[PDB]
Design a binder for this molecule. Sequence first.
Ligand SMILES: CC(C)CN(C[C@@H](O)[C@H](Cc1ccccc1)NC(=O)O[C@H]1CCOC1)S(=O)(=O)c1ccc(N)cc1
Lengths: 99, 99
Amino acid sequence: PQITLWKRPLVTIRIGGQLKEALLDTGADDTVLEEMNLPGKWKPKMIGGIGGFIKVRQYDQIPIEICGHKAIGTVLVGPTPVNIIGRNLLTQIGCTLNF
Amino acid sequence: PQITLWKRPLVTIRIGGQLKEALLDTGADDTVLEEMNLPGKWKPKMIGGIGGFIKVRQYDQIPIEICGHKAIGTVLVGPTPVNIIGRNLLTQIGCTLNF
Ligand SMILES: CC(C)CN(C[C@@H](O)[C@H](Cc1ccccc1)NC(=O)O[C@H]1CCOC1)S(=O)(=O)c1ccc(N)cc1
């Protein structure tokens, strides 16, 4: 689709059988989801944003269906304010900015 | 133009003929710029994301040119590590997300 920006670009995603709402976030390099269970191996990592750094759990090679479009990639889980879909997955689904 | 997301969507902006590089950020409700001593009235505000909140100064009706396109609106000013063009101005320059 084409998504305008008068409202937050929130879309439904499917991850591990569950529907969640997440924010298409071009200013985020990585994809970060609120506290959740995901199967398999993970590694501790830290990431920075506007307010400081946080600790996250890094899951590699995870499938997410983002607004009907399939991605498989790195998902970070931790204390983000909102579920955010970052460039690592926006690129997979062919997302570009246009004006 | 079309901006892919392989890299950070940094573009040239101008505010008071200071030219800065800024993120076209669909994840940001409001534009937030690095510390700069802008003239005019302002109100205090606190904005939050990954890592917590920062204190910013809200200036209204500030003109800004974004990649050659004119905008005018609210600009938040404070200790952000990156200049962020948020949805409040992205809409004014006709920016969409497309996939
Ligand atoms: C977290 C989202 C919901 C909101 N942020 C926008 C996001 O795009 C934010 C922009 C940013 C990039 C790099 C350093 C600092 C900030 N990226 C972000 O944290 O990227 C992290 C998570 C994964 O990759 C790195 S915001 O900066 O906090 C924000 C809050 C309020 C306003 N008015 C404007 C901006």
